[PDB]
Design a protein around this ligand. Structure first.
Ligand SMILES: CC(=O)N[C@@H]1[C@@H](O[C@H]2O[C@H](CO)[C@H](O)[C@H](O)[C@H]2NC(C)=O)[C@@H](O)[C@@H](CO)O[C@H]1O
Ligand SMILES: CC(=O)N[C@@H]1[C@@H](O[C@H]2O[C@H](CO)[C@H](O)[C@H](O)[C@H]2NC(C)=O)[C@@H](O)[C@@H](CO)O[C@H]1O
Ligand SMILES: CC(=O)N[C@@H]1[C@@H](O[C@H]2O[C@H](CO)[C@H](O)[C@H](O)[C@H]2NC(C)=O)[C@@H](O)[C@@H](CO)O[C@H]1O
Ligand SMILES: CC(=O)N[C@@H]1[C@@H](O[C@H]2O[C@H](CO)[C@H](O)[C@H](O)[C@H]2NC(C)=O)[C@@H](O)[C@@H](CO)O[C@H]1O
Ligand SMILES: CC(=O)N[C@@H]1[C@@H](O[C@H]2O[C@H](CO)[C@H](O)[C@H](O)[C@H]2NC(C)=O)[C@@H](O)[C@@H](CO)O[C@H]1O
Ligand SMILES: CC(=O)N[C@@H]1[C@@H](O[C@H]2O[C@H](CO)[C@H](O)[C@H](O)[C@H]2NC(C)=O)[C@@H](O)[C@@H](CO)O[C@H]1O
Ligand SMILES: *[C@@H]1O[C@H](CO)[C@@H](O)[C@H](O)[C@H]1NC(C)=O
Ligand SMILES: *[C@@H]1O[C@H](CO)[C@@H](O)[C@H](O)[C@H]1NC(C)=O
Ligand SMILES: *[C@@H]1O[C@H](CO)[C@@H](O)[C@H](O)[C@H]1NC(C)=O
Ligand SMILES: *[C@@H]1O[C@H](CO)[C@@H](O)[C@H](O)[C@H]1NC(C)=O
Ligand SMILES: *[C@@H]1O[C@H](CO)[C@@H](O)[C@H](O)[C@H]1NC(C)=O
Ligand SMILES: *[C@@H]1O[C@H](CO)[C@@H](O)[C@H](O)[C@H]1NC(C)=O
Lengths: 100, 100, 100, 100, 100, 100
C-alpha cells in the first residue's frame, strides 16, 4: 500500500522554539507534527517529503527545511523547520509512504 | 505502474487570474495544467507533487503553492499558484503517480 | 524495491561553474552529484526529486533548480543548480527511486 | 491483488456431456464452472489451475483435465474434464489469480 | 515476497490414521506437515497447493487430496490425504505463497 | 511481471530414456522441455508447477512427477517424468512464474 498526506504548518508564531542541533544556527523554531498512517504497515515504509507551499518574508533570508526525523511501521515524525531571523508565514509539506 | 512528469509553468504573465478561495488572499493567479497519464490506471493512483524550479522576485514575498486539485484513473489537475504582489518568473512542478 | 536518499549541496562556493544550456541564463553554477543505488535495479527506476532545505540570500532573486539529468539501473546524475547573481547558502535534495 | 478459490466438481454423473474438440476422444464430459472474482481486476489476471483432489475408478484409465478456457478481468471459465469410459467419483481444482 | 517449497509425504505407512470428517469416507490417513515461511509475512499470504508426484496402487482406486487447512503470517498446515483401501506409495505437494 | 504457460508432454513413446537418480527406480523416462520466458526477468522468478492433464494406463501403477530442475532469469528446465512399467498416454504441466 501507498499512503499520502499533507502537513500544513502555518505561521511560525505557533511553531515551537527548539534547541539547535547545528552550531551555526540559532533561534531554531519547528512545527513538528507526528503522523499516523491510516492503514498501518508492518515493515517501515520509505517516506519522501516535499515542500509544496511557501510564504516567506522577503526582507530576510529564506531559511526552511522539510525535516524527516524517523519512520516506523505505524507513522513518522517530520517538521517544518526554520532558524535565525527568517519569518515563515506559511509552509506545507505533502508526503508519500510506500512499502518496499 | 508508476509514471512521472514535469510541469513547467513559466512566467506568471501567462498564468490566469482566478478567484480566491482563501479570504486572506487576493490577486490569486494560477497556471493550472491538466495532465493525462501515458498508460492509464483503472483505479486512481496516489500522486505526489514537488517544486523543483523557482525563480522569484526578491523585493517581494515568496508566495507559491504546488497545488493538487484532483486525481482520476486517467490523469490529474494540478497548478502553480501565487497571490498578491508576489512575482514568479519561473516555477516547475515534477510529479509522480503510483498504483496502490 | 524502493530506495531513497538525500543530497546536501551546501554553500554554492563549492559548486562548480558550468556552461549555460539556456541562453537567457548566465553565471550558471551547479553541485552535480552522481548517485549509486545501494541495491541495484536491472531496469531503470522512476526517480522523483524534492527540494527540502533552502537557505537563500534575500537581497537577490531566488534562483534554484533540483535538476534530474539521467537515470540508469545503477544510479542517477542530479544537481542543485543556480544562476546569475543569486546566492545559495544551502540546498538539499531528497529523492526516491521506485521500480515500475 | 491475488485471489484464490476451489472448484469441487464432484461425481461425473452431474457433469454434462459435451461435444469432443479432439477427434481421438469421445464420450467427453465436463463440469464447467464459471467463476467471478470477489474483488474485480481491471486488466485480466494470470490464472493457474491445480488439481488437488482425485477419486478415480481403478479398473479403467485415469483420464482427467483441469481445463482453463478463458480469463477476463471479472472472472474465468474453467472445468473438470474427462472422456471415454473413465469414471470420476471426485475432482477438485484449486486456483489462483494474480495481477501482473 | 513470494515463497515456495515442496512437501514429500512418502509412503502412507508413515502417514497417521485420522478421524474422518466426511461421513462417506473411512480409513482416512494423512501426512499433515506444518510449514514455516523462511521470511515471515505480517499479513497471511495466499497459498496455492499443487500435487506434483504420484505413485498409487493400480488395483485400487486413486484416492488423494492435497489438503490446505489454514494459513497464518508465519506458515501453514497442509497435508497429503487418502482414505479407504487406496494405497499411496508416494505423494509430493509443491506450494507457493504470495502477499496480496 | 508474472508469466504462465503449458507443457504438453504427450505419449511417453516420445519421452527419452534417462538414467535413474533414485536407486529404487528403473526404466526412468522423461519429457524434459526447456522453457524461455517471453519477457525475461533479471532476477530468477519463483516458479510453481501443476499437473493438469493425466491419461494413464489402469492396469499398471500411476507413476508420475512434474519435475522442476532449475530456474534462471531467462527460463527454466522442467519435465514430465515416469518410471518402471507405468504407461503415460498423456501428461500436461501448466506453470507460473512470479518475480519476488
Ligand atoms: C552568511 C552569514 O553567515 N551571515 C551571518 C548570519 O548567519 C546566519 O545566516 C546564514 C545564512 O543566511 C546561515 O543561515 C547561518 O546558519 C545563520 N547563523 C545563525 C547563528 O543562525 C548571522 O551570523 C548574522 C548575525 O551574526 O550575521 C550574518 O552576517
Ligand atoms: C503579514 C501580512 O498580513 N501582510 C499584509 C499583506 O497580506 C498578504 O501577505 C501575507 C504574507 O506576506 C499573506 O500572504 C496574505 O495572504 C496576503 N494577503 C492578501 C489579501 O493577499 C497585505 O494585507 C498587505 C496589503 O494590505 O498588507 C500587508 O502588510
Ligand atoms: C526580469 C529580468 O529579465 N531581469 C534581468 C536579469 O535577468 C536574470 O534574472 C531573471 C529573473 O530574475 C531570469 O532569471 C534571467 O534568466 C536572468 N538572466 C541571466 C542572463 O542570468 C538580468 O538580465 C539583469 C542583468 O542584465 O537585468 C535584469 O533586469
Ligand atoms: C491406447 C488406445 O488408443 N486405446 C483405445 C481407446 O482409446 C481411448 O483411450 C486412450 C488412452 O487410454 C486415449 O485416451 C484415447 O483418447 C481414447 N479414445 C477415445 C475415442 O476416447 C479406445 O479407442 C478403445 C475403444 O476402441 O480402444 C482402446 O484400445
Ligand atoms: C462407488 C462406491 O461408493 N463404492 C463403495 C466404496 O466407497 C468408497 O469408495 C468410493 C469411490 O471409490 C468413495 O471414495 C467413498 O468415499 C468410499 N467410502 C468409504 C466409506 O471409504 C465402499 O463403500 C465399499 C465398501 O462398502 O463398497 C464400494 O462398492
Ligand atoms: C511396492 C514395490 O516395491 N513393488 C515392486 C516394484 O517397485 C516399483 O514400483 C514401486 C511402487 O509401485 C515403486 O515405484 C518403485 O520405485 C518401483 N521400483 C523400480 C525399481 O522401478 C518392482 O520392484 C517390481 C519388480 O521387482 O516388484 C514390485 O513388487
Ligand atoms: C509525536 O511527536 C512528539 C514531539 O516530538 C513526540 O515526543 C511523541 O513521542 C510523538 N508521538 C508518537 C505517536 O510517537
Ligand atoms: C483540464 O483543466 C481545465 C481547467 O480547469 C478543466 O476545466 C478541464 O475540465 C480539464 N480537462 C480534463 C481533461 O478533464
Ligand atoms: C558522475 O558525474 C560526473 C560529472 O558529470 C560524470 O562525468 C560521471 O560520468 C558520473 N559517474 C558515473 C558513476 O557515471
Ligand atoms: C459461464 O459458463 C457458461 C457455460 O459455458 C457460459 O455459457 C456463460 O456465458 C458463462 N457466464 C458468464 C458469467 O460469462
Ligand atoms: C503443526 O501441526 C500439528 C499437527 O496438527 C499441530 O497440532 C501444531 O499445532 C502445528 N504447529 C504449529 C507450528 O502451529
Ligand atoms: C534445455 O534442455 C536441455 C536438455 O537437458 C539442456 O541440455 C539444455 O542446456 C537446455 N537449453 C537451455 C536453453 O539452457
Amino acid at each position: 500500500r501507498v499512503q499520502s498526506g499533507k502537513i500544513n504548518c502555518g505561521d511560525d508564531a505557533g511553531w515551537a522554539k527548539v534547541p539547535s542541533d547545528d552550531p551555526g544556527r540559532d533561534n531554531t523554531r519547528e512545527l513538528a507534527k507526528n503522523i499516523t498512517f491510516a492503514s498501518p504497515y508492518c515493515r517501515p515504509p520509505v517516506v519522501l517529503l516535499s515542500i509544496t507551499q511557501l510564504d516567506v518574508e522577503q526582507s530576510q533570508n529564506l531559511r526552511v527545511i522539510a525535516r524527516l526525523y524517523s519512520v516506523s511501521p505505524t507513522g513518522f515524525k517530520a517538521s517544518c523547520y526554520t532558524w535565525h531571523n527568517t519569518k515563515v508565514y506559511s509552509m506545507s509539506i505533502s508526503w508519500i509512504s510506500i512499502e518496499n
